[PDB]
Amino acid sequence: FVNQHLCGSHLVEALYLVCGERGFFYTPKT
Amino acid sequence: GIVEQCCTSICSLYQLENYCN
């Protein structure tokens, strides 16, 4: 599911699922 | 950044995991 264009909430959802208990940082301007 | 790599181009697991804590 990750090997596609992922924007906005779709990208954050992928981060959430992939990173699991680690969490993640979402930095769209950097 | 992540938008350029995953939104305006095709994302990968390898690059998503770079943003995990």
Coordinates of all heavy atoms in Angstrom, one line a residue:
Chain A
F1 N 0.8 -1.2 0.0 CA 0.0 0.0 0.0 C 0.9 1.2 0.0 O 0.4 2.4 -0.2 CB -0.9 0.0 1.2 CG -0.3 0.0 2.5 CD1 0.0 1.1 3.3 CD2 0.2 -1.2 3.1 CE1 0.6 1.1 4.5 CE2 0.8 -1.2 4.3 CZ 1.0 -0.1 5.0
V2 N 2.2 1.1 0.3 CA 3.0 2.3 0.4 C 3.6 2.7 -1.0 O 4.1 3.8 -1.1 CB 4.1 2.1 1.4 CG1 3.5 1.8 2.7 CG2 5.0 1.0 1.0
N3 N 3.5 1.8 -2.0 CA 4.2 2.1 -3.2 C 3.3 2.8 -4.2 O 3.0 2.3 -5.3 CB 4.8 0.8 -3.8 CG 5.8 0.2 -2.8 OD1 6.9 0.7 -2.7 ND2 5.5 -0.9 -2.1
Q4 N 2.9 4.0 -3.8 CA 2.0 4.8 -4.7 C 2.2 6.2 -4.3 O 2.9 6.5 -3.4 CB 0.5 4.4 -4.4 CG 0.1 4.2 -3.0 CD -1.3 3.9 -2.7 OE1 -2.2 4.0 -3.6 NE2 -1.6 3.2 -1.6
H5 N 1.5 7.1 -5.0 CA 1.5 8.5 -4.5 C 0.6 8.7 -3.3 O -0.6 8.2 -3.3 CB 0.9 9.4 -5.6 CG 1.7 9.5 -6.9 ND1 1.6 8.7 -7.9 CD2 2.8 10.3 -7.2 CE1 2.4 9.0 -8.9 NE2 3.2 10.0 -8.5
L6 N 1.1 9.3 -2.2 CA 0.4 9.4 -0.9 C 0.5 10.8 -0.5 O 1.6 11.3 -0.3 CB 1.2 8.5 0.1 CG 1.1 7.0 -0.1 CD1 2.1 6.3 0.9 CD2 -0.3 6.5 -0.1
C7 N -0.6 11.5 -0.5 CA -0.7 12.9 -0.1 C -1.6 13.2 1.0 O -2.6 12.4 1.2 CB -1.2 13.7 -1.3 SG -0.1 13.5 -2.8
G8 N -1.3 14.2 1.8 CA -2.2 14.6 2.9 C -2.5 13.5 3.8 O -1.6 12.8 4.3
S9 N -3.8 13.3 4.1 CA -4.2 12.3 5.1 C -3.7 10.9 4.7 O -3.5 10.1 5.6 CB -5.7 12.3 5.4 OG -6.4 11.9 4.2
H10 N -3.6 10.7 3.4 CA -3.2 9.4 2.9 C -1.8 9.1 3.3 O -1.4 7.9 3.6 CB -3.4 9.3 1.4 CG -4.8 9.5 0.9 ND1 -5.1 9.3 -0.4 CD2 -5.9 10.1 1.5 CE1 -6.4 9.6 -0.6 NE2 -6.9 10.1 0.5
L11 N -0.9 10.1 3.3 CA 0.5 10.0 3.7 C 0.6 9.8 5.2 O 1.4 9.0 5.6 CB 1.2 11.2 3.1 CG 2.7 11.3 3.5 CD1 3.5 10.0 3.0 CD2 3.3 12.5 2.7
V12 N -0.1 10.6 5.9 CA -0.1 10.4 7.4 C -0.6 9.0 7.8 O 0.0 8.4 8.7 CB -0.9 11.6 8.0 CG1 -1.2 11.3 9.3 CG2 -0.1 12.9 7.8
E13 N -1.6 8.5 7.1 CA -2.1 7.2 7.4 C -1.0 6.2 7.2 O -0.8 5.2 8.0 CB -3.3 6.9 6.6 CG -3.8 5.5 6.6 CD -5.2 5.4 6.1 OE1 -6.1 6.1 6.5 OE2 -5.4 4.5 5.2
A14 N -0.3 6.3 6.1 CA 0.8 5.3 5.8 C 1.9 5.4 6.8 O 2.4 4.3 7.3 CB 1.3 5.6 4.4
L15 N 2.3 6.6 7.2 CA 3.3 6.8 8.3 C 2.8 6.1 9.6 O 3.6 5.4 10.2 CB 3.6 8.2 8.5 CG 4.4 8.9 7.5 CD1 4.3 10.4 7.6 CD2 5.9 8.4 7.6
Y16 N 1.5 6.3 9.9 CA 1.0 5.8 11.1 C 1.1 4.2 11.1 O 1.5 3.6 12.1 CB -0.5 6.2 11.2 CG -1.3 5.5 12.3 CD1 -1.0 5.7 13.7 CD2 -2.2 4.6 11.9 CE1 -1.8 5.0 14.6 CE2 -3.0 3.9 12.9 CZ -2.7 4.1 14.2 OH -3.4 3.4 15.2
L17 N 0.6 3.6 10.0 CA 0.6 2.2 9.9 C 2.0 1.6 9.8 O 2.3 0.6 10.5 CB -0.2 1.8 8.6 CG -1.7 2.0 8.7 CD1 -2.3 1.7 7.3 CD2 -2.3 1.1 9.8
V18 N 2.9 2.2 9.1 CA 4.3 1.7 9.0 C 5.1 1.8 10.2 O 5.8 0.9 10.7 CB 5.1 2.4 7.8 CG1 6.6 2.3 7.9 CG2 4.5 2.0 6.5
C19 N 4.9 3.0 10.9 CA 5.8 3.3 12.0 C 5.3 2.7 13.3 O 6.1 2.5 14.2 CB 6.0 4.8 12.2 SG 6.8 5.5 10.8
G20 N 4.1 2.3 13.4 CA 3.5 1.7 14.6 C 3.9 2.4 15.9 O 3.8 3.6 16.0
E21 N 4.3 1.6 16.9 CA 4.5 2.2 18.2 C 5.6 3.2 18.3 O 5.7 3.9 19.3 CB 4.7 1.2 19.4 CG 5.7 0.1 19.1 CD 6.1 -0.6 20.4 OE1 5.2 -1.1 21.1 OE2 7.2 -0.4 20.9
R22 N 6.5 3.2 17.3 CA 7.6 4.2 17.2 C 7.0 5.6 17.0 O 7.6 6.6 17.5 CB 8.4 3.8 16.0 CG 9.1 2.4 16.1 CD 9.8 2.0 14.8 NE 9.0 1.6 13.6 CZ 9.5 1.2 12.4 NH1 10.8 1.2 12.2 NH2 8.7 0.9 11.4
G23 N 5.9 5.7 16.3 CA 5.4 7.0 15.9 C 6.3 7.6 14.8 O 7.2 6.9 14.3
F24 N 6.1 8.8 14.4 CA 6.7 9.4 13.3 C 6.7 10.9 13.4 O 6.0 11.5 14.2 CB 6.0 8.9 12.0 CG 4.6 9.3 11.9 CD1 4.2 10.5 11.4 CD2 3.6 8.5 12.4 CE1 2.8 10.9 11.4 CE2 2.2 8.8 12.4 CZ 1.9 10.0 11.9
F25 N 7.4 11.5 12.4 CA 7.3 13.0 12.3 C 6.8 13.2 10.8 O 7.3 12.6 9.9 CB 8.6 13.7 12.7 CG 9.8 13.2 12.0 CD1 10.4 13.8 10.9 CD2 10.4 12.1 12.5 CE1 11.5 13.4 10.3 CE2 11.6 11.6 11.9 CZ 12.2 12.3 10.8
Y26 N 5.9 14.1 10.7 CA 5.3 14.6 9.4 C 5.7 16.0 9.2 O 5.2 16.9 10.0 CB 3.8 14.3 9.4 CG 3.1 14.9 8.2 CD1 3.4 14.4 6.9 CD2 2.2 15.9 8.3 CE1 2.8 14.9 5.8 CE2 1.5 16.4 7.2 CZ 1.9 15.9 5.9 OH 1.2 16.4 4.8
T27 N 6.5 16.3 8.3 CA 7.2 17.6 8.1 C 7.0 18.0 6.6 O 8.0 17.9 5.9 CB 8.7 17.5 8.5 OG1 9.3 16.4 7.7 CG2 8.8 17.2 9.9
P28 N 5.8 18.4 6.2 CA 5.6 18.7 4.8 C 6.3 19.9 4.3 O 6.4 20.0 3.0 CB 4.1 18.9 4.7 CG 3.7 19.3 6.1 CD 4.6 18.5 7.0
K29 N 6.8 20.8 5.1 CA 7.4 22.0 4.6 C 9.0 21.8 4.5 O 9.6 22.3 3.6 CB 7.1 23.2 5.4 CG 7.7 23.1 6.8 CD 7.4 24.3 7.7 CE 8.0 23.9 9.1 NZ 7.9 25.0 10.1
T30 N 9.5 21.0 5.4 CA 10.9 20.6 5.4 C 11.1 19.4 4.5 O 12.2 19.2 3.8 CB 11.5 20.3 6.8 OG1 11.7 21.5 7.6 CG2 12.9 19.5 6.8
Chain B
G1 N 11.8 16.9 0.6 CA 11.2 16.4 1.8 C 10.2 15.3 1.5 O 10.1 14.8 0.4
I2 N 9.4 14.9 2.5 CA 8.5 13.8 2.3 C 7.5 14.0 1.2 O 7.0 13.1 0.5 CB 7.9 13.4 3.7 CG1 7.2 12.0 3.5 CG2 6.8 14.5 4.1 CD1 6.6 11.5 4.8
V3 N 7.0 15.3 1.1 CA 6.0 15.5 0.1 C 6.6 15.3 -1.3 O 5.9 14.7 -2.1 CB 5.4 17.0 0.3 CG1 4.5 17.3 -0.9 CG2 4.6 17.0 1.5
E4 N 7.8 15.7 -1.5 CA 8.4 15.5 -2.8 C 8.7 14.1 -3.1 O 8.6 13.6 -4.2 CB 9.7 16.4 -2.9 CG 9.3 17.8 -2.9 CD 9.0 18.4 -1.5 OE1 9.3 17.8 -0.5 OE2 8.4 19.4 -1.5
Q5 N 9.0 13.3 -2.1 CA 9.3 11.9 -2.3 C 8.1 11.0 -2.4 O 8.2 9.9 -3.0 CB 10.3 11.4 -1.2 CG 11.6 12.3 -1.2 CD 12.2 12.5 -2.6 OE1 12.2 11.6 -3.5 NE2 12.8 13.7 -2.8
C6 N 7.0 11.3 -1.7 CA 5.9 10.3 -1.5 C 4.6 10.8 -2.0 O 3.8 9.9 -2.2 CB 5.8 10.0 0.0 SG 7.0 8.9 0.6
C7 N 4.4 12.1 -2.2 CA 3.2 12.7 -2.7 C 3.3 13.1 -4.2 O 2.6 12.6 -5.0 CB 2.8 13.9 -1.9 SG 1.5 14.9 -2.5
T8 N 4.3 13.9 -4.5 CA 4.5 14.3 -5.9 C 5.3 13.3 -6.7 O 5.3 13.3 -7.9 CB 5.1 15.7 -6.0 OG1 6.3 15.8 -5.4 CG2 4.2 16.7 -5.3
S9 N 5.9 12.3 -6.1 CA 6.5 11.1 -6.7 C 6.0 9.9 -5.9 O 5.4 10.0 -4.9 CB 8.0 11.1 -6.8 OG 8.6 11.0 -5.6
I10 N 6.3 8.7 -6.4 CA 5.8 7.5 -5.8 C 6.6 7.1 -4.5 O 7.8 7.1 -4.5 CB 5.9 6.3 -6.8 CG1 5.0 6.5 -8.0 CG2 5.6 5.0 -6.1 CD1 5.1 5.5 -9.1
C11 N 5.9 6.9 -3.4 CA 6.5 6.6 -2.1 C 7.1 5.2 -2.1 O 7.0 4.4 -3.0 CB 5.4 6.8 -1.1 SG 6.0 7.0 0.6
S12 N 7.9 4.9 -1.0 CA 8.5 3.6 -0.8 C 8.5 3.4 0.7 O 8.6 4.3 1.5 CB 10.0 3.5 -1.4 OG 10.9 4.3 -0.7
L13 N 8.6 2.1 1.0 CA 8.7 1.8 2.4 C 10.0 2.3 3.0 O 10.1 2.8 4.1 CB 8.6 0.3 2.6 CG 8.7 -0.2 4.1 CD1 7.7 0.4 5.0 CD2 8.7 -1.7 4.1
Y14 N 11.1 2.2 2.2 CA 12.4 2.6 2.6 C 12.3 4.1 3.0 O 12.8 4.4 4.1 CB 13.3 2.4 1.4 CG 14.7 2.7 1.7 CD1 15.6 1.8 2.0 CD2 15.1 4.1 1.8 CE1 17.0 2.1 2.4 CE2 16.4 4.5 2.1 CZ 17.3 3.5 2.4 OH 18.6 3.8 2.7
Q15 N 11.7 4.9 2.2 CA 11.6 6.3 2.5 C 10.6 6.6 3.7 O 10.9 7.5 4.5 CB 11.3 7.2 1.3 CG 12.5 7.4 0.4 CD 12.2 8.3 -0.8 OE1 12.5 9.5 -0.7 NE2 11.6 7.8 -1.8
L16 N 9.5 5.9 3.7 CA 8.6 6.2 4.9 C 9.3 5.9 6.2 O 9.1 6.7 7.2 CB 7.3 5.3 4.8 CG 6.3 5.8 3.7 CD1 5.3 4.7 3.6 CD2 5.6 7.1 4.1
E17 N 10.1 4.8 6.3 CA 10.7 4.4 7.5 C 11.7 5.5 8.0 O 12.0 5.5 9.2 CB 11.2 3.0 7.5 CG 10.2 2.0 7.6 CD 10.7 0.6 7.9 OE1 11.9 0.3 7.7 OE2 9.9 -0.2 8.5
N18 N 12.2 6.3 7.1 CA 13.1 7.4 7.5 C 12.4 8.4 8.4 O 13.1 9.2 9.1 CB 13.7 8.1 6.3 CG 14.8 7.3 5.7 OD1 15.4 6.4 6.3 ND2 15.0 7.5 4.4
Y19 N 11.1 8.4 8.4 CA 10.3 9.4 9.2 C 9.8 8.8 10.4 O 9.1 9.5 11.2 CB 9.3 10.0 8.3 CG 9.9 10.8 7.2 CD1 10.0 10.2 5.9 CD2 10.4 12.1 7.4 CE1 10.6 10.9 4.9 CE2 10.9 12.8 6.4 CZ 11.1 12.2 5.1 OH 11.7 12.9 4.2
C20 N 10.0 7.5 10.7 CA 9.6 6.9 12.0 C 10.6 7.4 13.1 O 11.8 7.7 12.8 CB 9.7 5.4 12.0 SG 8.7 4.6 10.7
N21 N 10.1 7.6 14.3 CA 10.9 7.9 15.4 C 11.8 6.8 15.8 O 11.6 5.6 15.3 CB 10.0 8.3 16.6 CG 9.3 9.6 16.4 OD1 9.8 10.5 15.8 ND2 8.1 9.6 16.8

